[PDB]
Amino acid sequence: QPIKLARVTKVLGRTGSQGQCTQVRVEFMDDTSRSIIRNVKGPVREGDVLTLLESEREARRL
């Protein structure tokens, strides 16, 4: 469970029967830099920084 600092590249939008979860895409900084995606709750600004405390959480899309 490593704390990894990643940069937001693109924010998808909201999901739910009424809308309750927010999709973003994050690129790592020092882990053989690549891009993954993850869902997230609450305000996450334009191009802010995410903390991937775990390197395996993937969010299902649609």
Added chain:
Amino acid sequence: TKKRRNNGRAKKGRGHVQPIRCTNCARCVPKDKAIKKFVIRNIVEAAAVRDISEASVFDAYVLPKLYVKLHYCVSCVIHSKVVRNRSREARKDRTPPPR
């Protein structure tokens, strides 16, 4: 009136075509009328690839694939959104979607 020139099937120059069963309902639909998909997916979803690759005994194992032939009746294929109703002019198009 006649909605389609081929009657929505691929039967030309023969009388009877053996029927198959829709993969969802098991409806009897002629093999040429049925909507056929050929899914070639990874046995491991792209989300679960990393764990099984890390836990793999054999380096460079290349995980196998699931090959499935899916037959759909028109009702189930419409409901599953595999096909959609199209306009009178766009109905004639036979080109598969670009994807």
Added chain:
Amino acid sequence: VVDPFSKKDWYDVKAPAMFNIRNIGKTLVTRTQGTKIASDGLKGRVFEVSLADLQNDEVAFRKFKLITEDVQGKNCLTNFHGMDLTRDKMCSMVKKWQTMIEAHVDVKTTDGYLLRLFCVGFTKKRNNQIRKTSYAQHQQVRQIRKKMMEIMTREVQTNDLKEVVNKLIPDSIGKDIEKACQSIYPLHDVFVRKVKMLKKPKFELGKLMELHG
């Protein structure tokens, strides 16, 4: 009430001589209590094991069913029981604009083993072909199937089981069929798809030992 793994011994099952890897895994069996004998519970159990785990320089989509024949020194000695291909490999080969030709022969070796070999082959599209579908006509298919059966019989009826499996390990029969039938219709992926044994000669302990080196 009773833990059943405290009364279960672990045995090692061995591959015959033709395979580089000798130990393929381990097997559980209950201790010899009462009427039941551990040497009777281990005389017909089959291991479907990939060839790549048997030969360090072979393909992974070839599975071999190896059957234990006798247990001594708490080691089970296996023998060739069958050959087959993984389902994913077989499904990856059946494409939709080519002819699939299947053949099979029942044939006995020179040690009495009776094998039913199934070979499969697929019509190859030429490198400059513009035609979408490469279909062999029915007489071409018949000729290819006759050649398949002739080659399989020629390879099996003369060699004993040891040399038959030696040929099966690199699929020499498939390559021979592919080379032969090039003049009828170019085939693409020729394989002895399956080998199943119908009857076997009466057990010879010395035969199995000589089989292991």
Added chain:
Amino acid sequence: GRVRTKTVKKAARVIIEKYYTRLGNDFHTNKRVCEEIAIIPSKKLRNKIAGYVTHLMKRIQRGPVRGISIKLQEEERERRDNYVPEVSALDQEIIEVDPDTKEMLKLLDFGSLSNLQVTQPTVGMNFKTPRG
């Protein structure tokens, strides 16, 4: 949204094509000149038109835009249209010619010409894309 309606778009376009000379880039100057040369009956609309003309000059300073036909850019473009190279591209000393076209030329009473180098035709008859 800040979408500029047809009124401000058309006014800015006509303003920029008619008096491109006076108009510039700094909003204060665009507003001043727009008031001076355009009878705009509002002040908010005047600021909107000046802002869009500023955007259009940011557009023109980095290439031509299809909406306007200013005299200077069109003059440069037509100047480019009378371009003529020193040596015509049809002044080829040697022209590579296949057997069939040289047969045509011989049947054309033009066979004495020595400019046409008869080439080796391609031996493959593969020219149609595969089907599927």
Added chain:
Amino acid sequence: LGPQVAEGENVFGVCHIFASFNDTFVHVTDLSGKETICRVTGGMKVKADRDESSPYAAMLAAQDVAQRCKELGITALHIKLRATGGNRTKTPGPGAQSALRALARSGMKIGRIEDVTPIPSDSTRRKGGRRGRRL
């Protein structure tokens, strides 16, 4: 009790993951398949019909299976997943993916991955009528 031979290598068993749409099975057995190490389904983990085939029940069963295999000596598994097969559906249920991922993530090593669902050379009539099922 268990094989403590060649500690630096792997001990291989096989898990038969029967991922039906009703529920999911995780069945680790001897390499020959004759002797069974441990079987956990999705139904003995959850008290609900709808969650029997859920990924949660499959993950719980896979974790329990991996724990039992670790304590019993087995270190690696060959995956043999399979759907209902027969004339019925050939698509593995929702529990296959989660169960396999949880086996990978629970201190186990994956060997060879195969699909062994039955595919008839042709079958009998399916449980529906000629008009299918209409709900």
Added chain:
Amino acid sequence: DIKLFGKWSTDDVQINDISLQDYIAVKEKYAKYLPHSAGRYAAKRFRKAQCPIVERLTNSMMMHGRNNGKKLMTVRIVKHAFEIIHLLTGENPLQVLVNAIINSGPREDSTRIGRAGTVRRQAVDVSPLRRVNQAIWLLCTGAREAAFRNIKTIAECLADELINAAKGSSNSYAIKKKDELERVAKSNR
């Protein structure tokens, strides 16, 4: 003479790293000698997040319909017993200050699934700011319930507020409720 407040100073509190200032950020005009900077924190999103941590903790406690937003309460509370404890301590509150809350904090929350079903929630995280502030809001509720129908009152928990404020270890209560929910939701990872 650029010392923050009258008793701290910014010339020595350094982390030699310019990326861990997500909680204490005193390097520019945003520094306050007294959090009563007035203003609004609901005009547009991310402007409640751009509140300083101190002012968010001191204000956000405004709830019920009678003490709703009356900034005089927040400023009087943060002045009272603060003026007292600064002289009566002598030592540094830094230890507890930091080491209860600002790494009591959880590391995930949960969100809705599919199109129906209210029997479990899928585990997601946030960039630690939103999670930490939701924990702070529930800790405000907890400080209420430790005052509301209880013994220890409001405007005497300045130790607990400093605990809620500063930087980096784990001792909380509402946050361990949040961590129990953490584990419950993470049972789906």
Added chain:
RNA sequence: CCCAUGAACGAGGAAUUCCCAGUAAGUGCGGGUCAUAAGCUUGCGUUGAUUAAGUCCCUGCCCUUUGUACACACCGCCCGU
């Protein structure tokens, strides 16, 4: 308005209306009605903000295709002793 004679004295059947920042809500004040007649309404300030900067799930709308035996237009039409 003053004597403090004590009223489940600390978030509420089914069904639920209104509301996104000086929102809501708490308050009072001025007009319309009129005898300084308001508990209504129309405005005005003072105190003042927890939640969401989303989606089409419910209700409903719209720049498309599609089906119809409806056109009094789906609260239609219509079948059956």
